[PDB]
Amino acid sequence: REIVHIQAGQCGNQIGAKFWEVISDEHGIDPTGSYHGDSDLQLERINVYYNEAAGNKYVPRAILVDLEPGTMDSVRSGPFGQIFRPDNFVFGQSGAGNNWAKGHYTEGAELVDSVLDVVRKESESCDCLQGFQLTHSLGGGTGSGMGTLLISKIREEYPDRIMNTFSVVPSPKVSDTVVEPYNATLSVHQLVENTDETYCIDNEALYDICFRTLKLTTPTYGDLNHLVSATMSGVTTCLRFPGQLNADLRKLAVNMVPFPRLHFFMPGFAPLTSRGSQQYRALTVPELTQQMFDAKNMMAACDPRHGRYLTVAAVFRGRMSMKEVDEQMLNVQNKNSSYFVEWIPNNVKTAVCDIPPRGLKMSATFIGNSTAIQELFKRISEQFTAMFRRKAFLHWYTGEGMDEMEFTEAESNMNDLVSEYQQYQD
Template identity: 60%
Template sequence: MPSREIINLQVGQAGNQVGESFWQDVLAEHGLDLTGIYQGSDPVQLQRIGVYFAEVNNGSQAKYVPRSLQLDLEAGVCERVRSGPMGALFSPETYLHGEAGAGNNWAKGFYTEGAELIDPILEVLRKQAENCDVLQGFQIIHSIGGGTGSGLGCLLLSKMREEFPDRMLATFSILPSPKVSETVVEPYNAMLSMHQLVDNGDLTVCIDNEALYDISVRALKIQSPTFPVLNGLISKVMCGVSTSLRFPGQLNGDLRKLGMNLIPFPRLHFLMPSYAPISDPKSQSFQGTSVPELVQALFDRRNLLVACDPRYGRYLTAATIFRGNISSREAEVAVQDLQRRNSNQFVEWIPDNVSVTLVSVPPVGQKQAAVALANSTSIQALFQRTHETFSAMYKRRAFLHWYTGEGMDLMEFSEAESNSQDLIAEYQQYQEARAGDEDEYSEEEQQEEAYAEEGSQ
């Protein structure tokens, strides 16, 4: 059976830094060195390696080249990756960059600088797609607070939606936080990006800077965490999410199945990731990782990579992915037990809404680990936070000349704001819905059907 391929795109400075960390972990799990030559001894490592890698035979040894594009609007980041330890891993034609940079401006990334670079990017993307046997979709790693990751990332999403309408578009989107802010216009960039992600993404895994800092300080005991530490946390989650795609396992063998199990309504595709165990390396040997403990940790807000509290919402769906030598019965019983004890936190009108995936390959250096992706209505707190900081500036029309100067219309800001309000209202509506409220649904169902029809057209 051929591997169902995924093409990875890392956009902007944050996207490339996280991407570098992700590829280091993936190489280690598949037994490859930094040039893509196989050094491992376990046949499972090569069984589905084709999901992320293309095999190239030059001479006697097979080399595995990641199916990945490194994109930025200035040369610095791409040059750093190219001259770094992994420079020889990626194909030279997959480094694409502009010269001017986006200057933290969404409009530059989407309309001016990004638009100049989009044709060469699509050309390389088509070439990568044509070399695939059964392309299942794309994953984009980007930050939505800056200019390149948000602007160019959203432009790419909309173009890919036109070009590959039937493929899955998954994004790992790093959301800005007022506590960890680099620029004052982050709320504008984030709001405009959310507007595009709602309409063009199929699966958005939200990663929140605030939660990453919190985990690093509280669990890893690192008082002033650096970017490599934060990126390492993100890549752990990314590797966990993609485990069932990269190794033989039970359930969720590709992106579409993952989406099918997690997304009940097309617009509500924003997922909260969590990882377990997260602990200080010094105290690792003193902690147990029994399956019930892993499950408990996955649904603990302190292990969430999003700064919101699931106790104030309800879980629509969740997917748990266990790694290591874990029996399926043990995992399923632990998940059912947690659901039974916290039944008021799970919507009762979706039965069996927590799926369990088992993969026998643990992360490098660990015996057992688990990742969860949760679709919870409490994520509206995240959108509410962005909405409040956005509204405070937009009321005064502050900094807007930077955006209108690039040819943007003010209407786009208003549209993005109302789309965000609609999304928050939709989450709230399904949070309050109860299994017996049949009459209320007729109108909403019609609305959902209309969305679905629009999507299929």
């Protein structure tokens, strides 16, 4: 039950930097590799995430991908870089330059061949692959461009493994590039088609969490990605660890998706709390559900009170009663059934993991799949049309070899995607 983690692009590498830190702490693994934890859990399920080398060394089953060493170099240079083997630093020079066409279509493909060779080498060492996880930004040339190439080729090799990816949704407040939503559309066109599931991450919403609910002052990407990693680990650690309602991801996905083409997720983390609150807030499952249900804790700028939920996953960590959980789950559906899909009478899936989080007594994560997600796609299409009409910057991509009808096709597919949510929205 191994999981392959591929980090790609400036952000994928940066996000994954926090993710692996978290995981290492979760299992009591020293930055230089050795395990010093004290629970059976910490040892026994390393498996998934680390290769045990002699000497008690554990190496992350992951590859860091980019066309510039920069980001990866800073990681290697600093803390936790030492846990990574040289073989996980696959990069060229020069980068794409935020160009999807160069990443996917030209230049990074060349690197991708070596990336996948390494992946293959890891898949040979794997005992039992459960699946793959990619971390990247939707609008990024290497993250998404190269990432989408990797996805299409990995699924080719392994149709039956879980293909998942976590992606950053371009935020209205932070464009980089003019064609950031262009890159996103191009990737979406492939991402939808080639993955089993993808997570929607909106920085702007994450900032909202940071300050509005956590009242923190200055979010860095590391703090924001810390938040993200909490949910990523929330998801998979319970896959790893024993529990009561184990929800393998695959199973989950099964349950999450009623329709093959709608595989977008809305994660949210529950025990979000400011420090002040610590002294005032009781922690119960209903408390966690209050924070799960509340749209303000969503990690993406989509309002679940606007859209309708297809599926809701409710991840629990810690020794909760089944009654308490089940009753509260039910209570949520009793209250606002109107925001759920009509044809499924129980749209919320519990998944309780016995194992407590470190530190917290209880923890929970919300994962959903709602029609509200279409709003972000609409934002993309909106911008795209402006851009497309005047081919702004397109010449750069044209030089790479992209056709206007190719982009049009991608747009169409975006339009389809939005209509698909409309079909079940109502």
